[PDB]
DNA sequence: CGTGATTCCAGCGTCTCATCTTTATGCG
DNA sequence: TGGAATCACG
RNA sequence: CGCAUAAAGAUGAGACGCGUUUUAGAGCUAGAAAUAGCAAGUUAAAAUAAGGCUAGUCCGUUAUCAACUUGAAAAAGUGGCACCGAGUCGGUGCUU
């Protein structure tokens, strides 16, 4: 026997592999065909390579879960609204709650009357004409004082409750018909008062379009300033304006403050620090800043509600009424327009729901753009049509009230009118009165991102800790959920365990101790030449105990230039020290320290070392948490050793980031016989210029033998190494799965023997790639706890092979066959191999006709079937949505996914006069009915009708099962009613080297002698052009079967057969997606189309070989169906 | 009533909080 | 790119 | 492998606006019909994978998968070799 070596192809579609020698040949075997067939044995040479779909990232997911979740907490919202007065809706009328749930269904499954909201016609009637949107009801609730109706009242509640806008504005708003021009002129004045040196002015300046317009916020603010008679941006004006729209300024430059002091308007860390600012800066700027903030609310409300109504406080409501009224008055306008001329358009405008005129834009499904885009042309050939031409311009003709743009609605205005509407209703319906809290709660509830699913244990994306088994509702949250542990459980699932000790956790990016390793660890490098010394020598571990004291523990930044002149010739006094290493970085430095010396009340309490236990405490709930309410919570436990004004100090700090060491690793392990930490020997350098980055593997200390042993202590699983990988960015390890696959298969198809000289082929990933090939073997130790290389990885920057394949020749034309997957591997083990190591072999091996193609089997999963609901027809192709929703009365969903098929043999009543025959049939499952089918599958086929099934005789057939018919025919199984061309044409190379350099396949390339013998090339082998199209035909004749196509293309060739050669193959190239494996793909050429011939038959199969494939396809398991019937 | 062609179609768009990674250069 | 429908006929 | 800076992918969570579907929002007129004339149109309820049991304000579209023996599963196990060729793999021989 001889060794191997593999080389290996990733990939997202496919993966290749081969299997060379010592000299690049490829070996050849023969293998069993096991199974009912006279062929048992099939030779095969090893070079193949796997097909496969690509692996689909989990955004597509969680985007469906996270609205399903949204879904059933509106539901709940609801459900929580109607419990509410669940006993005095049965007052009035019981059923109510009962008509909406069943509103969907048609009058034969109704069990009441049919309409939902009063159970009579009259009175339903009476409901859309008073109020033909529900902004009339919602602005009707909101301004009235007459005793409504609770199922009206439900309806508003509902209505907002189930759209409740949008959660971005952190805080609380109230339009109470406020002006924006007045605060402005307000804020001019306050600004004044104080400001007499160099009052503002409002000449030239629009107080109302300029704050108002579609610009965005930053670039209304410096138009803003433009238009001001000559303030700076940078001014104190200027920030206030800037605030007044939204903008975060920092006052420091302005009130000479003790802090930075950013006003975060959009955050709600503004409640605070403006409280901040009236703490250092006081009353002097209370009202402006009252002004300030009433002029942000103000614009940014105006922003999205265009209009400025005043005779009601229901600004949304009242938006959309007027929106109904201009687009009915609109409507009414253009149709007499396009009746008093242009008369021949009207049909096709108001009553056609094919075109997207109003009728398509109503009813049939067409959008504003569609409509806008139809309507235009119409408008401009006819006189009058100056109001209109106007609004269409500007988005705002026939709009609807429930659209694309809705979506800048804040939920405080939703909660404004709910407020209003309960406010209006409560004395008329008392048990209103003491339900207020419990609906407005229902509204403005989120959950935080913090706490997430609320599940009791079985929910795999759950972290949420309950201080009680109670149910959670929005009004027991508060206290059944511990906010604290789940916030700290957010971060903490989710931040890193420290690799040096894999079982727990690192420390914060600033912490104490990490603040001081991330600087001893530095300084340690530094060099001095002085008198008395015979050589160069680093600082000593004494020298820097001293120095950090009286540089580093002093002030907010050091650096070299200050040492080499501060420290040396006045601390110790060197005579005339020479200072060497970095000229003036030094790039780590106790931030930390100082904050807390600016925050906290003594540095005693900073250079005492015995408060580090509470230090890394606090710095710990600074950097998980955010919320303020949760610090709040947390730091208190710790503020009694500290003023309350202290408190407040630390309160608004915030860090941000983790390390990658942890704090154990750092102070809690001891030498076993020096008993000192890592934070210790960087504190005793010594003579050797120690540090960490040879503690941890100098066998000298324990530390290397801990840190080896926990690395050990962590493991227990190995196969699921493969998903961790790269931590994230791809979902294609798809490839790097399979890849091992077939290192795993070769080696139990090569004699269990092992490679030698593995190449994997395609930095930033493939570093990750290969370990995990030389961990999954390549495994024997030696008496040392010594791995022995018993093989050798390699790999390659996805590169160097593509170079080799034009330096000799050996082109790729990608799109006749799959054949370069495999090829590219093996010319990847061939440089591979030479790297470290006949010339002929190359060229057998590119003339290949077999190479092992496998398009892995798979059972499709994912969606059940294409989403769309579409309307009810007469077939059987409709699915319900529900257990009670026939689709011929309600519509469904169509076109299913089938995980795989069946063959099936058995009985079915057949005839005018019913009687059994014998059958042969594939069902196709769907995605759906695999729980039903793999539960018992002959109960599942015998209520299809089928009767007499035999169990033994039921096959599964994934998708892509390939079947081989006459002549060498082979089909794979799409999803049971369609075929898929399952061969590959094995276009020899002669014709692969002509269409490359003819096509000039890259643009044009080549140096001037190469660029003549690569064209004469061309030139002299005309003749290729007119065998090309024999391969073509003779091979689809054989196996494509695609007669009508093929003449087609015969007969476009012949008549464009006299254009330039290049041309002739730049389009015969496209002649191959008839060809190529797999789906059929209509292809054109020379602007002639040559449609797709598809396949829909899965009747052939039916009495043809079946061939089950290993992962690699050299193992099969080849059954004859016609032995089966 | 069983074959075979041509045509059409497909859910989408926002905000926010955190958390890993790799790429590119400059030092050890 | 696979399901479904509309169309031509032997 | 750690430090200094910027951008791009992956994971999770919390939320919005739409869209579709059946129904509800008594169409009138010439008629015996087809069909034609007129009027109206902008809103809502419900569902948004069927559904599951663990019964949660949880789970349900990612990952994984040839066949065969043992199987509750996990998982293990199952298919000699060489040399001369080439159209999807064929031939010859030692072996058994």
Redesign the pocket.
């Known amino acids: 026997?001889?060794k191997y070596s593999i080389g290996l192809d990733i990939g997202t579609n496919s993966v290749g592999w081969a299997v060379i020698t010592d000299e690049y040949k490829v070996?050849?075997?023969?293998?069993?065909?096991?199974?009912n067939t006279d062929?048992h044995?099939?030779?095969?040479?090893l070079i193949g390579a796997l097909l496969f779909?690509?692996?689909?990232?989990?955004?597509?997911?969680?985007?469906?879960?996270?609205?399903?979740?949204?879904?059933?907490?509106?539901?709940?919202?609801?459900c929580?609204l109607?419990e509410i007065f669940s006993n005095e809706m049965a007052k009035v009328d019981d059923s109510f709650?009962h008509?909406?749930?069943?509103?969907?269904?048609?009058?034969e499954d109704?069990k009441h009357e049919?309409?939902?909201?009063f159970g009579n016609?009259?009175d339903?009637?009476a409901?859309?004409?008073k109020?033909?949107?529900?902004?009339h009801?919602r602005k009707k609730l909101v301004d009235s004082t007459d005793k409504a109706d609770l199922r009206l009242i439900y309806?508003a509640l509902?209505?907002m409750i189930?759209?409740?806008?949008?959660?971005?504005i952190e805080g609380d708003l109230n339009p109470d018909n406020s002006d924006v021009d007045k605060l402005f002129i307000q804020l001019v004045q306050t600004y004044n008062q104080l400001f007499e040196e160099n009052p503002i002015n409002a000449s030239g300046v629009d107080a109302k379009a300029i704050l108002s317009a579609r610009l965005s916020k930053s670039r209304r603010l410096e138009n803003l300033i433009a238009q001001l008679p000559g303030e700076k941006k940078n001014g104190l004006f200027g920030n206030l304006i800037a605030l007044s729209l939204g903008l975060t300024p920092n006052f420091k430059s302005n009130f000479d403050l003790a802090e930075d002091a950013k006003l975060q308007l959009?955050?709600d860390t503004y409640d605070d620090d403006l409280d901040n600012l009236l703490a250092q800066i006081g009353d002097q700027y209370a009202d402006l800043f009252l002004a300030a903030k009433n002029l942000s609310d103000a614009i940014l409300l105006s922003d999205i509600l265009r209009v400025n109504t005043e005779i009601t406080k229901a600004p949304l409501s009242a938006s959309?009424i007027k929106?109904?009224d201009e687009?009915?008055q609109d409507?009414?306008l253009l149709?007499a327009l396009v009746?008093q001329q242009l008369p021949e358009k009207?049909?096709e405008?108001?009553?056609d729901?094919s075109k997207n005129g109003?009728?398509g834009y109503?009813?049939?499904?067409?959008?504003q753009e569609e409509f806008y885009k139809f309507i235009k042309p119409i408008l401009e050939k006819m006189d009058g049509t100056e109001e209109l031409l106007v609004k269409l311009n500007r988005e705002d003709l026939?709009?609807?009230?429930?659209?694309?743009?809705?979506?800048?609605?804040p939920?405080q205005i939703?909660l404004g009118e709910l407020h209003a509407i309960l406010r209006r209703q409560e004395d008329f319906y008392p048990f209103l009165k003491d339900n207020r809290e419990k609906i407005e709660k229902?509204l403005t509830?989120?959950?935080?991102?913090?706490?997430?699913?609320?599940?009791?244990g079985?929910?795999?994306?759950?972290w949420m800790t309950?201080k009680s088994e109670?149910?959670?509702?929005?009004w027991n949250?508060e206290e059944?959920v511990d906010k604290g542990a789940s916030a700290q459980s957010?971060?903490e699932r989710?931040?890193?365990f420290d690799?040096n000790l894999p079982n727990e956790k690192?420390l914060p990016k600033h912490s104490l101790l990490?603040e001081y390793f991330?600087v001893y660890?530095?300084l340690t490098?530094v060099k001095y030449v002085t008198e008395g010394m015979r050589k160069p020598a680093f600082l000593s571990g004494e020298q820097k105990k001293a120095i950090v004291d009286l540089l580093f523990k002093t002030n907010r930044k050091v650096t070299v230039k200050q040492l080499k002149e501060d420290y040396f010739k006045k601390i110790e006094c060197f005579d005339s020290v020479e200072i060497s290493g970095?000229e003036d970085r030094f790039?780590?430095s106790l931030g930390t320290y100082h904050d807390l010396l600016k925050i906290i009340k003594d540095k005693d309490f900073l250079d005492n070392e015995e408060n580090e236990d509470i230090l890394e405490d606090i710095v710990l709930t600074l950097?998980?948490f955010?919320d303020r309410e949760m610090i709040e919570e947390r730091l208190k436990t710790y503020a009694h050793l500290f003023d309350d004004k202290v408190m407040k100090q630390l309160k608004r700090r915030r860090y941000?980031?983790?390390?990658?060491?942890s704090r154990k690793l750092i102070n809690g392990i001891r030498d076993k016989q020096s008993g000192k930490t890592i934070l210790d020997f960087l504190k005793s350098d010594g003579f050797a210029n120690r540090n960490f980055?040879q503690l941890i593997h100098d066998d000298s200390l324990t530390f290397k033998e801990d840190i080896q042993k926990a690395q050990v202590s962590g493991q227990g699983d190995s196969?699921h190494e493969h998903?961790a990988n790269?931590?994230?960015?791809?979902?294609i390890?798809?490839g790097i799965?399979?890849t091992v696959?077939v290192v795993d298969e070769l080696v139990?198809?090569?004699?269990?023997h092992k490679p030698e000289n593995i190449v994997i082929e395609m930095?930033?990933?493939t570093?990750?790639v290969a370990q995990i090939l030389d961990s999954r073997m390549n495994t024997k130790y030696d008496e040392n706890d010594k791995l022995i290389r018993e093989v050798k990885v390699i790999t390659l920057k996805s590169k160097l092979v593509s170079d080799f394949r034009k330096d000799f020749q050996f082109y790729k034309v990608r799109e006749i066959?799959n054949y370069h997957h495999a090829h590219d591997a093996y010319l990847n083990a061939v440089v591979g191999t030479a790297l470290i190591k006949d010339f002929a072999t190359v060229r057998?091996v590119l003339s290949?006709?077999?190479?092992?193609?496998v398009k892995?089997?798979?059972?499709?999963?994912?969606?059940?079937?294409?989403?769309?609901?579409?309307?009810?027809?007469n077939?059987?192709?409709?699915i319900?949505?529900?257990?009670?929703w026939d689709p011929k009365?309600?519509?469904?969903?169509?076109?299913?996914?089938?995980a795989y098929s069946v063959l099936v043999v058995a009985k079915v009543e057949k005839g005018k006069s019913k009687k059994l025959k014998s059958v042969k049939e594939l069902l196709?499952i769907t995605?759906?009915?695999r729980?039903?089918f793999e539960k018992n599958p002959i109960d599942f086929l015998e209520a299809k009708g089928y009767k007499e099934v035999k169990k033994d005789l039921i096959?599964?057939l994934?998708?892509y099962?390939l079947f081989?018919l006459e002549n060498?025919r082979?089909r794979m199984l799409?999803?049971?009613?369609?075929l898929?061309k399952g061969?590959?044409?094995?276009?020899?190379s002669k014709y692969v080297n002509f269409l490359y350099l003819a096509s000039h396949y890259e643009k044009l390339k080549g140096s001037p002698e190469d660029n003549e013998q690569k064209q004469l090339f061309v030139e002299q082998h005309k003749h290729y052009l007119d065998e090309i199209i024999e391969?073509i035909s003779?091979?689809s004749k054989r196996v494509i079967l695609?007669?009508?196509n093929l003449d087609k293309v015969l007969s476009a060739y012949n008549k464009h057969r006299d254009k330039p050669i290049r041309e002739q193959a730049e389009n015969i190239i496209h002649l191959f997606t008839l060809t190529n494996l797999?789906?059929?793909?209509?292809f054109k050429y020379f602007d002639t189309t040559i449609?797709?011939?598809?396949y829909?038959?899965t009747?052939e199969v039916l009495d043809a070989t079946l061939i089950?494939?290993?992962?690699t396809g050299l193992?099969?398991?080849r059954?004859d169906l016609s032995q089966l019937g």
């Open positions: 026997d001889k070996p050849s075997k023969k293998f069993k065909v096991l199974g062929r044995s099939i030779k095969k040479n779909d690509s692996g689909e990232t989990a955004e597509a997911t969680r985007l469906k879960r996270t609205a399903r979740r949204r879904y059933t907490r509106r539901k709940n919202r609801i929580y109607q709650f008509r909406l749930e069943e509103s969907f269904l048609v009058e109704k049919r309409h939902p909201i016609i009259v339903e009637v409901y859309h004409e109020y033909p949107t529900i902004y009801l309806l509902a209505h189930k759209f409740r806008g949008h959660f971005l959009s955050k959309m929106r109904y687009h009915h409507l009414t149709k009746r009207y049909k405008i108001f009553f729901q109003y009728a109503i009813d049939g499904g067409a959008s026939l709009r609807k009230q429930r659209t694309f743009d809705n979506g800048s609605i939920h939703h229902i509830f989120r959950i935080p991102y913090y706490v997430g699913p609320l599940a009791r079985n929910s795999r994306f759950a309950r109670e149910t959670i509702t929005p949250f059944v957010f971060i989710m931040t890193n690799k690192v990490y991330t660890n530095e490098k970095v790039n780590a950097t998980l955010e941000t980031g983790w390390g990658r060491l980055m196969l998903i790269l931590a994230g960015s791809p979902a390890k798809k799965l399979q696959k139990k198809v090569m004699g269990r930095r930033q990933i570093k990750h066959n057998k290949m006709p077999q190479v092992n193609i892995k089997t798979e059972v499709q999963t994912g969606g059940f079937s294409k989403e769309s609901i579409l309307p009810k027809r077939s059987d192709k409709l319900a949505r529900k257990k009670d009365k309600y519509g469904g969903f169509d076109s299913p996914t089938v196709g995605i759906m009915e729980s039903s096959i599964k994934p998708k099962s081989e060498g082979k799409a999803s049971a009613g369609e898929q061969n590959e044409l094995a276009l020899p391969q003779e091979f695609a007669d009508a797999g789906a059929p793909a209509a449609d797709r011939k598809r829909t038959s009747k089950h494939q290993s992962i193992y099969e398991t059954i």
